[PDB]
Amino acid sequence: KLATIRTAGEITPIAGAEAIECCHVDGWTCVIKKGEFKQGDRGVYFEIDSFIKEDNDRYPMLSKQVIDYEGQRGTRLRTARLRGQLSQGLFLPMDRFPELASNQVGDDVTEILGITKWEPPISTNLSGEILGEFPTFISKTDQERVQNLIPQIEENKGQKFEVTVALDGSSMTVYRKDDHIGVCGRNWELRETATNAQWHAARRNKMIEGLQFLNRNLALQGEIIGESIQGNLEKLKGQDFYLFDIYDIDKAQYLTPIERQSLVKQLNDNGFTVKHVPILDDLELNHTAEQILAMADGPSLNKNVKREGLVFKRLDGKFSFKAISNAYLEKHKDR
Ligand SMILES: Nc1ncnc2c1ncn2[C@@H]1O[C@H](COP(=O)(O)OP(=O)(O)OP(=O)(O)O)[C@@H](O)[C@H]1O
Ligand SMILES: [Mn+2]
Ligand SMILES: [Mn+2]
Ligand SMILES: [Mn+2]
Numbered sequence: 001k002l003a004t005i006r007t008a009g010e011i012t013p014i015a016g017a018e019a020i021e022c023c024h025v026d027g028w029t030c031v032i033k034k035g036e037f038k039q040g041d042r043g044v045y046f047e048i049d050s051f052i053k054e055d056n057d058r059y060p061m062l063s064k065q066v067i068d069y070e071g072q073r074g075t076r077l078r079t080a081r082l083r084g085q086l087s088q089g090l091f092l093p094m095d096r097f098p099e100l101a102s103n104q105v106g107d108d109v110t111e112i113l114g115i116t117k118w119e120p121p122i123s124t125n126l127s128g129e130i131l132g133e134f135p136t137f138i139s140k141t142d143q144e145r146v147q148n149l150i151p152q153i154e155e156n157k158g159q160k161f162e163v164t165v166a167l168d169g170s171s172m173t174v175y176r177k178d179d180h181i182g183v184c185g186r187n188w189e190l191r192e193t194a195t196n197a198q199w200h201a202a203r204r205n206k207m208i209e210g211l212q213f214l215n216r217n218l219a220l221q222g223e224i225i226g227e228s229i230q231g232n233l234e235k236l237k238g239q240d241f242y243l244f245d246i247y248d249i250d251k252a253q254y255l256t257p258i259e260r261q262s263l264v265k266q267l268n269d270n271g272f273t274v275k276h277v278p279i280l281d282d283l284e285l286n287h288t289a290e291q292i293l294a295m296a297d298g299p300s301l302n303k304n305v306k307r308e309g310l311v312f313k314r315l316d317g318k319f320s321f322k323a324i325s326n327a328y329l330e331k332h333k334d335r
Helices: 060-065 150-155 197-204 207-214 257-269 289-296 326-331
Strands: 003-007 011-013 020-025 028-033 042-046 050-053 067-069 072-076 080-082 085-087 090-093 130-133 160-166 170-177 180-184 188-190 218-226 239-248 309-314 320-324
Touching: 028 085, 028 090, 060 072, 150 289, 170 197, 170 207, 170 239, 180 188, 180 197, 180 207, 197 207, 197 218, 197 239, 207 218, 207 257, 239 257, 289 309, 289 320, 289 326, 320 326
Parallel strands: none
Antiparallel strands: 003 042, 011 020, 020 028, 042 090, 050 072, 067 072, 080 085, 130 188, 160 309, 170 180, 170 218, 218 239, 309 320
16 A cells, blocks of 8 residues: 555644755655645555655655666655654655545555566575465464554554564564465465575474474465575574464464463474564553653664664454564665
């Protein structure tokens, strides 16, 4: 949902820059031209990671940022700082889009506006030979951002969440379905070869044997991190897998934080040395999105580096979200 119709929230002036002002859009804050919106006005909000194909009539404000990306000319939206003011996304009034004049607030207009997703380059050894599609009987590893979850954050006041450090690597799934055990990246099941990093990590921590021991239809989902993976923020030597979720294939449901933690303990008790993403204290939710984003900055798995952020998974395993550190996004312009 890169481009959606949203509502201008609080509009606050930026001291010393009378030509612009700060617009809150859900949990995001975004610099607009002074007077472009009033609180309550609707517009199209384009999230960071939007890639907006070149168009100086509709998008002249992006003109000097046009780059070549996957053979297209256009602009990547990313976190910026303007006059000391944090700015994320692009927010344009509805009258700039006459073809949306009878759409509704909340509508996803990504496809109609031709917006595509920008992503960092995938790391060398994490692209292997493809064996097949990512299994349709396993959920992929996505997380919604807290900035997009204002009402849900409200409903969940008092609920308890497992808090884990978000690790900056590549998503990796190792699973068992009856007589088949497979290793996947984010979007594909991979063939075992000598150079495949994901298979190597699954063999080295004995997690294939661990799945054979547990004898259940489970998908172990985690982050492979380390050297030549997204710049190796943790300064690891070699590479390693860090579990964050277990999907129950037979029940088509994630395991709860407590079910997952005890299964990981049994694996390690039996010699299967599967590591887990860092687990912090459980959080009783009673927070605004702004407050959640403030906890996002802090120590990573390597305590001497600042983390990508935090993932919150409710104790029933049925509601999860991610809070990315904005200091992290400011420091790492390649993501
Ligand atoms: N502790 C954690 N819990 C859950 N996921 C984690 C954790 N640490 C790292 N991750 C990664 O976070 C990803 C979900 O976050 P997010 O939706 O931001 O994904 P993404 O790869 O950044 O995609 P995009 O950039 O397109 O939104 C997962 O796919 C997983 O690889
Ligand atoms: Mn991204
Ligand atoms: Mn995502
Ligand atoms: Mn990531």
